[PDB]
Design a protein around this nucleic acid. Structure first.
Ligand SMILES: Nc1nc2c(ncn2[C@@H]2O[C@H](COP(=O)(O)OP(=O)(O)OP(=O)(O)O)[C@@H](O)[C@H]2O)c(=O)[nH]1
Ligand SMILES: [Mg+2]
Lengths: 293, 74, 96, 88, 232, 92, 159, 54
RNA sequence: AGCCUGAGAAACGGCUACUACAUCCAAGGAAGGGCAGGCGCGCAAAUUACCCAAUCCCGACACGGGGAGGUAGUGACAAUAAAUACUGAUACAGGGCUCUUUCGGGUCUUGUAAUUGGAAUGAGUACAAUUUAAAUCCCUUAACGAGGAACAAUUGGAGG
């Protein structure tokens, strides 16, 4: 009888509201934010993750970085800068969150601000606490006390029993390879994103490449004039309108689409190339960072 | 130059009610509950509390009432 | 209901949102639609100010109500994975 | 199994489209169904103020969102607001 | 690689040497009738602490077993092997006790020079020569022609020759090295043939307890004549 | 700093003197086993370099501290008869 | 029930206990001892089981000082009680030996490591002090009531 | 008395012995109210009758 | 399905042919067949930890090599012990408490957000030394470490 009771409780746990998926057959790269207070090493984790995946030592990685992590799915890493406008801009955008806590110093208001901004706007599937600066400790009893109290406060903040990784040192200016390897074990195998209503009704795009296509005669005539801008990125929400789509460039204002060119990917992800083996040969570990080095 | 997290976010108090300094310690509460329930007992029955003092017998110090029978009638 | 202790549901419509007196049970009651079976049952939010956290089309856990409308059997326990008394006590924010 | 029946009706609609605009390229795939999601695309925006191009930093990213027909109208929004727990 | 409890109950190990126990290497004495040299040095005598310390004792020529240098650590030394250590100037001898366990006996060169070994079989070897096989698997070429089966021999141990022998006798005191009455120094007073396999002897102690042990498990030690010093 | 040696064993085949050492610091902190190696030179008429101390658990409530001490006949006998970790802890 | 509440409150007040879990703990071990005494009274007199097991139980209780040395029958072992057990606790023994002014002072002293039982200091106030060990309850040598340093508020004041 | 014989130190129990000896309390009726032990009145009481008859 | 080594195998370690997958290529060719981990809804909960240092095993052999073994980390599922205060003096108020029987009876010291004074200190911070393969814990341990607006007790229920 108790087996039937537990089966009924789990069958009631499995249920949710029937919302619409709106995910294509060839899905766009899932967006990984690296959010944290200033000085915590978001750029260092970005360098270390892109070296783990695509083996390219970036001396200054900026912008979104698209990365092939499987034959079906791929990721893109964006590091949020230390400004609240960018944090509120990307909290409605993020697919998975890498939320950084500064170890010995404890929690920060920027971390709590992004946690409740994200919860109020829309909760994504996977948020992973990443706790760093553990090597700035002298007593390894105080170390496990700080790990325990930061884990319990984070569990009160987002949900009980989350994933909190501990990244200890900085060896080659980068991170330890085993620690970022188990971190990528957790963020590599993946599940479909949560059906958020705002992302499943409105079409968005996160700009990978920027270019100013303006005539130098116009720039020489008026140095402060209305320019035309080519913005290249992945179409992520629902589909854009074919003509006359109204666009909010967040932080700039509202405009209209003058042209859409729909062109093939720079990160092809071999299911799209072959359109049942497990491993990824190094032919496939592509890197598309059109603003970084 | 960092933004410290303050005590209200550090422990999620929320809107728990205000309770007593007696209620924050379960022994001191059970000390004060026993002192006041031993005090309520003297107002019902009569405790011994020492016989005649060192000074002797200064009279029945709080009244003598004549028309009061306080014996268990068997 | 069912064979379980708590059921899930979708808040269809907060019936009695235009009731006059603040802690009326018609003000506190909410029509939800159970996921597993599909029927629309009515449930009590525990408090009138706590009604404001229950929005339309939210996944709602509900349990029995064991003790002004006698016979409404269920009470809303959790809303969108967060406990409703915790939302009322301002411990947690609601993930939407 | 009302949950799986509702999710199956949603997947039936999600097969009915992509079964219904899989019939022509220049008419359906370009003009009916727009520019489908997941595909890399280049946008040309006309009329951007030059202070954006002069103060463009690659750190702070660019998010392009699509406004609906209702998201360009102005008027009195009536909202349900509450101050935060930790706002002093 | 056997466990400490699966090790036999007659070379003792306490709660100290880990859960495992060394196995004896293959050699003269048997497996279950054996004391390895590491158990003799560091678990019985405690002249050592660790395996590496026992190796550092064994590898240098400091431990001689039956008059020859024995190098490997788990060398089997079951019964009555004189163990000469020269830096300490001692010679130990392995006997049993009345309960059924191994016992060590300190002695000098005069009793350390000879070994009392029980004859296993007599045969005619190649070359038409009689040879003699003891329980130490010592084969002696050209023996004395009366030394039959179950007779014991005083082996010289500096040449290895025969010096004296004790006959199997009803009236000669003996030591039990097997069976349910193991390790009971008493006198052979009767012997029953049982032809067809597994004959017995009836044996009594010094103080009147009769019991029947098998002629395989017996071992002659002397009529009165304690030619090895049983510990007083 | 009060010292007593119990169970002193000769061990000539391993060539090293084995002592159960009961040291006592009452009122002091712990004993600093390198300074205890320095102390076990004149007590048994040896060089400091041929002494190795291990074990050394402090008894409950201060005072008594039980160590195990080994004095070798030569530093080279120590070098060829000591474990690597005890050699590192000693400093050779 | 009000009888249980008033009884447990009388125990918690008369011996300076923290909650009712300590009362229920003592009542459980007392009921175990009393159940053993009832099972030994089930058998007849001069049975060897009752003889040796009852002598073991009575000698154990007299040695741990609960049962008085005068009365040594299994009927008095049945007549045992939780007031006798809480009297054999350490905290009430400090209060009765007079090292502390009240029972809550005694609990405070035993918590912050002033008294010692025999040789070692005792950090727990529910230490069941035996009869042989009752006499050797005194202030430790590292305590300012025993000796050594004058202490903490004394050091901050004398600076 | 085993740490002065050849004076190698011990590990203070381990996870596999503490799993065993603390499970021994789980299947036994013994209790230690003070310095003494209080044994249960099961089969340990029947041997007292079982010895005295022989 | 057949074969090869060796003291010990019908090793599955290799080979051959057939069958079935599957990879690189310059399209001629060429190498290859395990477990562990995560997801198993869109909503979740024990380390991808360190070493052969002890016991043990294999070798030309004291040194070289061991996925048994031992060390550490998590844990409100339980279970064990118990902090969040102890103790005075003075000043002032005259009420405090109870009930069967209630516009009635019973009992006699109780308070206060009053003013002051003493001490005690373990959580934590922590020099060391020690423990240990190297660390940690434990035991030792110099120095700091309490006045509420804090070193910040909770969960429920009833009522003004
Ligand atoms: N010891 C230690 N140092 C770290 C750790 N993580 C980062 N650092 C150092 O802290 C510095 C911060 O650099 P970043 O990580 O780029 O800082 P960021 O916040 O990521 O980048 P900005 O947002 O531009 O400041 C670097 O120089 C790192 O070497 C850590 O886990 N341990
Ligand atoms: Mg950055």
């Amino acid at each position: 009888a108790r087996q039937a009771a537990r089966s009924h409780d789990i069958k009631e746990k499995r249920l949710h509201v029937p919302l619409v998926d709106r995910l294509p057959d060839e899905p766009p790269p899932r967006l990984v934010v690296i959010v944290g207070p200033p000085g915590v090493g978001k750029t260092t984790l970005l360098k270390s993750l892109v070296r783990r995946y695509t083996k390219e030592t970036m001396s200054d990685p900026v912008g979104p970085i698209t990365v092939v992590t499987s034959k079906k799915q791929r990721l893109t890493f964006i590091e949020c800068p230390n400004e609240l406008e960018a944090m509120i801009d990307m909290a409605k955008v993020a697919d998975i969150v890498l939320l950084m806590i500064d170890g010995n110093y404890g929690f920060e208001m920027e971390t709590m601000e992004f946690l409740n901004i994200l919860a109020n706007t829309g909760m994504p599937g996977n948020v992973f606490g990443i706790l760093t600066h553990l090597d700035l400790f002298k007593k390894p009893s105080a170390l496990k006390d700080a790990k325990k109290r930061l884990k319990h406060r984070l569990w009160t903040e987002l949900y009980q029993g989350a994933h909190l990784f501990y990244l200890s040192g900085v060896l080659n200016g980068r991170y330890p390879d085993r620690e970022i390897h188990n971190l990528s074990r957790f963020l590599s195998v993946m599940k479909n994103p949560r059906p958020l209503v705002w992302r499943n009704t409105h079409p968005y795009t996160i700009i990978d490449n920027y270019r100013d296509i303006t005539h130098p005669t116009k720039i020489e005539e008026d140095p402060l004039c209305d320019r035309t801008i080519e913005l290249s990125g992945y179409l992520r929400g629902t589909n854009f309108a074919a003509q006359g789509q109204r666009v909010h460039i967040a932080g700039v204002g509202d405009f209209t689409i003058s042209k859409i060119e729909e062109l093939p990917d720079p990160c092809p992800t071999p299911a799209m190339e072959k359109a049942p083996r497990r491993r990824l040969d190094e032919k496939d570990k592509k890197l598309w960072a059109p603003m970084a080095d | 130059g960092k933004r410290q997290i303050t005590w209200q976010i550090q422990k999620n108090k929320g809107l728990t009610p205000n309770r007593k300094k007696e209620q924050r310690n379960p022994r001191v509460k059970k000390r004060k509950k026993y002192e006041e329930k031993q005090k309520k007992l003297r107002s019902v029955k009569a405790v011994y509390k020492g016989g005649e003092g060192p000074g002797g017998y200064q009279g029945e110090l709080s009244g003598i009432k004549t028309n009061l029978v306080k014996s268990v009638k068997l | 209901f069912g064979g379980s202790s708590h059921a899930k549901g979708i808040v269809l419509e907060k019936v009695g949102v235009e009731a006059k007196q603040p802690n009326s049970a018609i003000r506190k009651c909410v029509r939800v639609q159970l996921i597993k079976n599909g029927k629309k049952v009515t449930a009590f939010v525990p408090n009138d100010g706590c009604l404001n956290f229950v929005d339309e089309n939210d996944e709602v856990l509900l349990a029995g109500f064991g003790r002004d409308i006698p016979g409404v059997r269920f009470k809303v326990v959790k809303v969108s994975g967060v406990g409703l008394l915790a939302l009322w006590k301002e411990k947690k924010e609601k993930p939407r | 199994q009302w949950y799986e029946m509702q999710k199956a009706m949603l997947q039936k609609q999600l097969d009915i489209n992509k079964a219904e605009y899989a019939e022509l390229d220049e008419h359906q795939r370009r003009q009916v169904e727009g520019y489908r999601a997941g595909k890399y695309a280049r946008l040309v925006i006309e009329g951007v103020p030059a202070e954006f191009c002069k103060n463009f930093q690659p750190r702070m990213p660019i998010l392009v969102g699509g406004l609906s027909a209702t998201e360009d109208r102005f008027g009195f929004v009536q909202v349900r607001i509450k101050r935060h727990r930790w706002h002093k | 690689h056997q466990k400490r409890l699966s090790a036999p109950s007659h070379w003792l190990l306490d709660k100290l040497s880990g859960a495992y126990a060394p196995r004896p290497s293959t050699g003269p004495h048997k497996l279950r009738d054996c004391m390895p040299l590491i158990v003799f040095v560091r678990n019985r005598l405690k002249y050592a602490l660790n395996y590496r310390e026992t190796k550092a004792i064994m590898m240098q020529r400091l431990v001689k077993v039956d008059g020859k240098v024995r190098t490997d650590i788990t060398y089997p030394a079951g019964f009555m092997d004189v163990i000469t250590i020269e830096k300490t100037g001692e010679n130990f001898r392995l006997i049993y006790d009345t309960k059924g366990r191994f016992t060590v006996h300190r002695i000098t060169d005069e009793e350390a020079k000879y070994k009392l070994g029980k004859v296993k079989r007599v045969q005619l070897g190649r070359g038409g020569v009689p040879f003699l096989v003891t329980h130490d698997a010592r084969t002696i070429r050209y023996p004395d022609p009366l030394i039959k089966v179950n007779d014991t021999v005083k082996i010289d141990l500096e040449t290895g020759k025969i010096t004296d022998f004790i006959k199997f006798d009803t009236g000669a005191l003996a030591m039990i090295t097997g069976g349910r009455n193991m390790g009971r120094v008493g006198v052979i007073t009767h012997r029953e043939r049982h032809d067809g396999g597994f004959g017995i002897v009836h044996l009594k102690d010094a103080l009147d307890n009769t019991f029947a042990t098998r002629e395989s498990n017996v071992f002659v030690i002397g009529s009165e004549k304690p030619w090895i010093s049983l510990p007083k | 700093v009060t010292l007593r040696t119990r169970k002193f064993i000769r061990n000539p085949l391993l060539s090293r003197k084995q002592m159960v050492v009961d040291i006592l610091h009452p009122g002091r902190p712990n004993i600093s086993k390198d300074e205890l190696r320095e102390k076990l030179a004149t007590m048994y008429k040896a060089q400091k370099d041929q002494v190795s101390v291990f074990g050394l658990r402090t008894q409950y409530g201060g005072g008594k501290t039980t160590g195990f001490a080994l004095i070798y006949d030569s530093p080279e006998a120590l070098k060829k008869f000591e474990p690597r970790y005890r050699l590192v802890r000693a400093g050779l | 029930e009000a009888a249980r509440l008033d009884s447990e409150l009388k125990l918690v007040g008369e011996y300076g206990l923290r909650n009712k879990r300590e009362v229920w703990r003592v009542l459980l071990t007392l009921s175990k001892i009393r159940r053993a005494a009832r099972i030994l009274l089930t058998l007849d007199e001069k049975d060897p089981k009752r003889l040796f097991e009852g002598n073991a139980l009575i000698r154990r209780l007299v040695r741990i000082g609960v049962l008085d040395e005068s009365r040594m029958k299994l009927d008095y072992v049945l007549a045992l009680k939780a007031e006798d057990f809480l009297e054999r606790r350490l905290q009430t023994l400090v209060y009765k030996l007079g090292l502390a002014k009240s029972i809550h002072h005694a609990r405070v002293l035993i918590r912050q490591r002033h008294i010692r039982v025999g040789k070692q200091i005792v950090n727990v106030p529910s230490f069941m002090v035996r009869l042989d060990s009752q006499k050797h309850i005194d202030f430790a040598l590292t305590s300012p009531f025993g000796g050594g340093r004058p202490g903490r508020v004394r050091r901050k004041k004398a600076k | 008395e085993y740490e002065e014989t050849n004076f190698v130190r011990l590990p203070k129990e381990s996870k596999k012995e503490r799993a065993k000896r603390a499970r021994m309390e789980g299947r036994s009726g013994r209790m230690n109210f003070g310095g003494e032990e209080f044994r249960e009145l099961g089969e340990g009481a029947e041997r007292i009758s079982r010895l005295t008859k022989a």
